[PDB]
Symmetry: C6
Subunit: 216 residues, 6 copies
């Protein structure tokens, strides 16, 4: 990645063995559970396009997902090229094309040049945005359950049902507003008869905390 040294300068630093192993192990253990995306984003802080490709390429399994990710990257690259056409002056910085942002046709030195320019052309952040769009699509595709099928069991603690409900909603990746709206609507409808009766009596505008206390 590109980090700050002590004369305040932005310099390249090798991706660390700790970072590499952390990402490989997170994919092995969590596959494409939603929390893998924020872990990817944190582990790739300051990454060049080369670093991002390294992280993705070091994944051994899940090649269906990785092929879908390549399709998404290429689509985002194509839209980049449409909005930002390109074309060389001796010793001058050229403009990155989509494939340069994705690190396929650009060199590490070109990537460092763009990222450390004034003003910086943040090819790492742009590429990471495309990758996260792709991973989100994979997370949704690999979501095992529809929120419509998350219903509280007759003897299931309300807390465990709510955990399942919002876990599913996260993989299904509804908005943060919908997740705030299902509290008074779908969460109540999918509760079991005993808790539903209690939740109905709480009235409108009950917080999640109040609902969970009531059915505790």
């Amino acid at each position: 990645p590109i980090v700050q040294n002590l004369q305040g300068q932005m310099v390249h630093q090798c991706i660390s063995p700790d970072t590499l192993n952390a990402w490989v192990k997170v994919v092995e253990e969590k596959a494409f559970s939603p929390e893998v995306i924020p872990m990817f984003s944190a582990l790739s802080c300051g990454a060049t396009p080369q670093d991002l490709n390294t992280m993705l390429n070091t994944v051994g399994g899940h090649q269906a997902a990785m092929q879908m990710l390549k399709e998404t990257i290429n689509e985002e690259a194509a839209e980049w090229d449409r909005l930002h056409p390109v074309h060389i002056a001796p010793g001058q910085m050229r403009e990155p094309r989509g494939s340069d942002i994705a690190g396929t046709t650009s060199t590490l030195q070109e990537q460092i040049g763009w990222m450390t320019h004034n003003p910086p052309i943040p090819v790492g952040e742009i590429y990471k945005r495309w990758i996260i769009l792709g991973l989100n699509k994979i997370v949704r595709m690999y979501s095992p359950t529809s929120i419509l099928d998350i219903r509280q069991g007759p003897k299931e603690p309300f807390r465990d049902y709510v955990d399942r409900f919002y876990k599913t909603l996260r993989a299904e990746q509804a908005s943060q507003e919908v997740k705030n709206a299902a509290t008074e609507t779908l969460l109540v409808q999918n509760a079991n008869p005993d808790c539903k009766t209690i939740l109905k009596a709480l009235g409108p505008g009950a917080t999640l905390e109040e609902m969970m206390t009531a059915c505790q």
Copy 2:
């Protein structure tokens, strides 16, 4: 997080793989036992709002708790906006709204600008305060036992009973004064007959050490 470099300057540094893994594993192993809060606070030393969201977002389970935390954050954000209304000068620092402190509508660069300003607007510390308020509520909600049900078993060593008593009191999160007051009151009443007789004979003003020695 934001740390000091060697020309004494406050600079951004990537959240480390060690920090990320430590938090994920602490939640997996301890869930919302009370000691998780001071671990969270220590692991997030110097954190930006982005770093705090990373830590919370990397948690895979417990989505009922994480949704309750979002509600608490939004409430604290709303109170921030009520006390601190907002509203742009070219190239000047704008004032953070509640959602900016929570890192949802602010960029990393804006967060760094506020935290490293003179005087600093410590959006990381403000947001961490809101998160800890939320986690405390979760710790209390997930406390499995009332202190009224912690009673010494007929053959239970007094030390083991006291461990259970103050463990429960901590999750129930009574004040630090009440924890000092239950020593002469509820701790004695919930002891078994044999130790209670001994504790009654010690008289008023006995320290916890003296009570534990007496019933040892």
Copy 3:
């Protein structure tokens, strides 16, 4: 903690995930065996009062011990206040009270101010002293055996008996002089008949090495 940077300046540094985990695991594995105290002291080198509270607060179990520690800290704080009364000048350093040394009513910045002052008011070292006094009391309380009950078994190797003897003496925390004096007195009396006869024949002034060789 507070450490030295390269322009020779004393600066604050975040407590590391390694340090935090090491302490948590040492308590989990060793509880309050005597060797935990020197480990605590080493892991808290340079600690602020905040860091010391973090270490103590991250302990999940043993809440009877942690409550006893709080009592000891409050007693030491009260004695501090009696010897050092307090009381504000704009922008000037105030004097720490007992609760400020214990980090309950002082901020991190105040703690850094005191510790890095010229001359420094070492609130971290003062607080650590109080904590160690408390931990010592806990180690003694949780010592499972009196030295009077450590007696060599008829077939127990002398080395194993001596290990048990000085292990118990350490938890019972006799002086370093008494530990040097029991060599010729209690260690011999509690040996088994066969070794005792040999030890009696060595005469006065025998070293531990000589006694262990003789009964080997």
Copy 4:
């Protein structure tokens, strides 16, 4: 490897125990699965020829593969010598031959001299290129299955078949274009009758995402 210090200078640094262990363990666990190549490239960032030989020499097993790699390196070295003949001025930098790039007849100091020259003669990057050519050949040789034998089982989830298909294609190392072309051709032909009927109905130009959704 060669890294940047703080006066901006390119200096040699010892290969770290973390790097050494990571590579040894990656070979032990993954053998020559395709993802081992990008891990090798990332772990050898900035490596001198000495460092590259260290990494290869620390591998204990797989000596058939390592002997094949030596053959490939020697072939690339021979082509280097053909394109770049060589031949000494007192205290002047000599030109590297193939065996010097491979680190067999060059010293560490000569390697540092070339890599840190202005302009740099990047013997580490040149040698790494030769090694990766060799590893690719090994990955292909050790690929256990032809893509022609990857056919969806009657009850095999389409996702699992696609994982196997592109995993095999990766080891077989078809182009990135062919991997984009097999989506509409071989992937459909090797699907089971039920999914094939669905995929045929999607029509031409279907994305991998659309095909996987259709057969989900």
Copy 5:
């Protein structure tokens, strides 16, 4: 320990959690096998007397050995005091007594003052010398076997016998010269009849390599 910073200055640095854990685990796993001494010496590189006491005090078991070590330290301290009598000028460095070198009556700051003086009074190196003398005595005491009882079994590979022979000799801690002399004398006499006949035929001046090849 005391280490060099970048303005070339000798400064104190906290003992690291890695160092602390490494020593504790080496004692737990190896007890007082001879190789523990060089590990102790390496882990305590640059240590102050405080650091050395920390390492010794963090050991939980083996209190018979640790008490013997204290006796040896006190003996060496007494000899120090006899050779180097002591006795204060305001703000001047006093001379260390034996107990100051052992870190019992000296402060960390006094220790740093002596170690970083010009010329340095290396109290850490002096104390480490005393500790190693004590550990050597313990290693010898805890040596389980006399070299006289190491005899090659009728079917024992010569290599395994030689491993046992020099392992025992190391714990018994004969000189490095004796270990070179037993090659032609005791090593042959304690071999089994079949190898002894072969070794006798090699003649005088045979190297260990030649003896091991002959009986292989």
Copy 6:
């Protein structure tokens, strides 16, 4: 070891706990398999003679091998003394004898003086050369199989036979030329009848890759 700091100066640095543990564990797990030598060389990058002795002395087992290594070191030391006789000027650097290079009669400060001199007298690199000569002899001695006994089993995959063949050749440590020559000679002769017939038909000058493909 001796490393570069930031004013470009060669300074001593303590051997790290990571390095120490890595070497100890490599010997425990791999004994004297050939790949242990390049691991030793990499882990001892920049080592002083003291560091090299530390690494060798921390090995607990294999004392027959370590005694053979001492013999080899002494032989190389004797040859050093024969080629480089020695013999003192006040405050001047003396010339190292064989035992000084091996770190037995030299101090750390003398070692640092020689290694950081201009021009440097690289006692660490010279001593490491002697140690590697000794380890190579041990690797050969402990090689369990002659290459003459590595023959392909009737049903053994050719790849597995070639792995065994070059693994044995490596321990037997034939030249790198012989390893290139056995490809067309001994590798074919020791193959099983079925593969041998195929290999004979390939003709002269077949590469290892071609032979392995043919018998795959």
